[PDB]
């Protein structure tokens, strides 16, 4: 079943990484009323907003992450939230951590003797899920700061978080199984 567990871990890691990468790259995060010219229904992601339907359909414009005049930067929380949202540092960090976990899984497959690689993969997947959570919260909060809906990229990211957490649990289970087998073999040989 260990082989089945490894296959599930690899498939889930790849699926979560692909879903997160597609969610970050694509721009179907939010359907809302707005203007894509640089008010009609538009779909927007982390970087671009594009009109759908109408006569200007297909035109995309970069999202203005630092809007409004007079640039009221007296406070720090608003500027920090705007900067974090503009960089999208947490979704990209989740993507990077998912890639690192997949790399750790592959390296452990190559080695099959250093159990700490499995633990590192599990830690990477759990941290990727946490980064996904933080990025989702930051994105929604920045959207708050007029009927809207969430697109399939947003739910791709949510499913990526779910799958990353499941794969992290599986990797921790494999690490525990490896150490238990090592202890049992040590007991048997002595």
């Amino acid at each position: 079943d260990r082989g089945v567990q490894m296959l599930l871990t690899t498939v889930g890691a790849f699926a979560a990484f692909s879903l997160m990468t597609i969610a970050v790259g694509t721009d179907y995060w939010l359907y809302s009323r707005g203007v894509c010219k640089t008010e009609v229904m538009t779909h927007s992601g982390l970087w671009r907003t594009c009109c759908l339907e109408g006569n200007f359909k297909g035109l995309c414009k970069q999202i203005d992450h630092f809007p409004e005049d007079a640039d009221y930067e007296a406070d720090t929380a608003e500027y920090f939230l705007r900067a974090v949202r503009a960089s999208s540092i947490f979704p990209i960090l989740s993507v990077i951590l998912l890639f690192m976990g997949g790399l750790c899984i592959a390296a452990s497959e190559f080695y099959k003797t250093r159990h700490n690689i499995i633990l590192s993969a599990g830690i990477f997947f759990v941290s990727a899920g946490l980064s996904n959570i933080i990025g989702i919260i930051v994105y929604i909060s920045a959207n708050a700061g007029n009927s809207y809906s969430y697109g399939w990229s947003f739910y791709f990211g949510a499913l990526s978080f779910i799958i990353a957490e499941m794969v992290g649990v599986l990797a921790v289970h494999m690490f525990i199984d490896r150490h238990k087998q090592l202890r049992a073999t040590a007991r048997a040989t002595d």
Partner: protein
């Protein structure tokens, strides 16, 4: 144009849908992290069993109990597990207080599309409960059936 009564799922009204989604994600993440910090280290292991009872299923159960203001039969003992539990407890206090501040008022909002709460206003609470009971029954029965089949495989 009659005033529209709150729906069966009007108990979700006090919080936005995004809050509910993030609550589910936070619950999953806290359960996973609690299980990880409780079980990953071989030094927490003694066939062989762990020094603690915080497997993934038990971690999910403990997190659900903490969020429901109920508690369970286990509690984290290590430093990292207690950090997870304490931060989840603080989160639960804040979120549950915010949710239950105005729940009854949210359950009786007549919309354009002090009185006692009526059964209708909480009917959706009962249905889910009964549904859960039925679900649990089914699950139990299935397990029994499965084991019965296995017993036959043992009897041959």
């Amino acid at each position: 144009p009659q005033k529209s009564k709150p729906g069966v799922f009007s108990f979700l009204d006090p919080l936005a849908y995004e809050i509910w989604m993030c609550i589910v994600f936070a619950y999953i993440g806290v359960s996973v992290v609690l299980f990880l910090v409780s079980r990953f280290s071989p030094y927490e292991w003694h066939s062989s069993e762990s020094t603690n009872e915080f497997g993934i299923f038990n971690s999910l159960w403990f997190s659900l109990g903490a969020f429901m203001q109920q508690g369970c039969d286990i509690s984290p003992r290590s430093l990292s597990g207690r950090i997870v539990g304490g931060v989840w407890w603080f989160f639960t206090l804040i979120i549950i207080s915010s949710y239950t501040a105005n729940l009854a008022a949210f359950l009786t909002v007549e919309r354009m599309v002090t009185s006692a709460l009526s059964l209708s206003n909480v009917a959706g609470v009962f249905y889910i409960l009964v549904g859960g009971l039925g679900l649990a029954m089914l699950v139990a029965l299935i397990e029994f059936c499965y084991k019965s089949r296995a017993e036959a495989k043992r009897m041959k």
